[PDB]
């Protein structure tokens, strides 16, 4: 019987894999910006 596994959405490299990659990158770019701002504010101290 044919089955599947974990993390097979990005393996197919279809629309959903690219969508997930773009969403993760866009979220973590904002998170990196916030962390950089906080680190700069801390380093000013």
């Amino acid at each position: 019987g044919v089955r599947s596994g974990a993390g097979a959405v990005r393996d197919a490299g279809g629309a959903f894999g690219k969508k997930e990659q773009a969403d993760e990158e866009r979220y973590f770019r904002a998170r990196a910006r916030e962390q950089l701002a906080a680190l700069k504010k801390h380093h000013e101290n």
């Binding site: 974990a6 969508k19 993760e24 979220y27 950089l36």
Partner: protein, 283 residues
């Protein structure tokens, strides 16, 4: 030619006097299939002499060992053999084993063999790379998906295996760090499917931390190479084992959850990661 000139200018091969440390055996793709099916034997024969006749340790670098199987397959049809699966020779496993068993550490000497194995179409279920897995203690699988992300080396963390990976050999701390890294990367693979439909912003606060740690670990696995300075431009790094263990343990513990994931990309020790983080913060 590039390797020959690099080793000439690196002092490993010295033309002026007899202080060279590397022998070269070269049968390239322009050679007929008969030649490419025997150069591995010639190189491993030189290694065998350096192992048995002299008691010194030997390093045997083969690139690429798949061409031996490919050359055998090329000559098999004219040799008068019914083709095996995927058009390989019926004697694939036999000849591959006959070659590989010679490259072993004996009681007289030890040969450390670093063989590069070409995987056709990136299909590791192909017989030629599949049969080689049983012949190797430590295996390093470089995947195209990781390379396309920019992570170099493209070693697959969840596919590479080593026989010495065991708490009784590498210590409890090393084994725990490695298993934690692999487990968190597997959990990240599981969560990627959810992120595909649900959306990253819709995830819980607990698994967002796991995803961030997994991203940091994926980027921190990357490392610039001295031989790769011409491409990336970064200075080559050589991280000691304890530094790698400490850095990955700190990342697992969340000690650097306040640093951006960009700081862990193409760096050496974790101190370089924090230095890059604060340098990015300065701008």
């Amino acid at each position: 030619n590039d390797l020959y000139h690099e080793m000439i200018e690196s002092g490993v091969i010295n033309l002026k006097d007899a202080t060279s440390k590397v022998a070269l055996v070269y049968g390239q793709m322009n050679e007929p299939p008969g030649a490419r099916a025997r150069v591995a034997l010639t190189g491993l024969t030189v290694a065998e002499y350096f192992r048995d006749q002299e008691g010194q340790d030997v390093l045997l670098f083969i690139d690429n060992i798949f061409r031996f199987t490919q050359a055998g397959s090329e000559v098999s049809a004219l040799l008068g053999r019914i083709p095996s699966a995927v058009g390989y020779q019926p004697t694939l496993a036999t000849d591959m084993g006959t070659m590989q068993e010679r490259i072993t550490t004996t009681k007289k000497g030890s040969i450390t063999s670093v063989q590069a194995i070409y995987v056709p179409a990136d299909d590791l279920t192909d017989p030629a790379p599949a049969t080689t897995f049983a012949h190797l203690d430590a295996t390093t699988v470089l995947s195209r998906a990781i390379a396309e992300l920019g992570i170099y080396p493209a070693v697959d963390p969840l596919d590479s295996t080593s026989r010495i990976m065991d708490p009784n050999i590498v210590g409890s701390e090393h084994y725990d760090v490695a298993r934690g890294v692999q487990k968190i990367l597997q959990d990240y693979k599981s969560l990627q499917d959810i992120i595909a439909i649900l959306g990253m912003d819709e995830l819980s606060e607990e698994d967002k931390l796991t995803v961030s740690r997994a991203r940091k670990i994926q980027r921190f696995l990357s490392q610039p190479f001295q031989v790769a300075e011409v491409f990336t431009g970064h200075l080559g790094k050589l991280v000691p084992l304890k530094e790698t263990i400490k850095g990955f343990q700190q990342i697992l513990a969340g000690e650097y959850d306040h640093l951006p994931e960009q700081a862990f990309y193409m760096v050496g020790p974790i101190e370089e990661a924090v230095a890059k983080a604060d340098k990015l913060a300065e701008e």
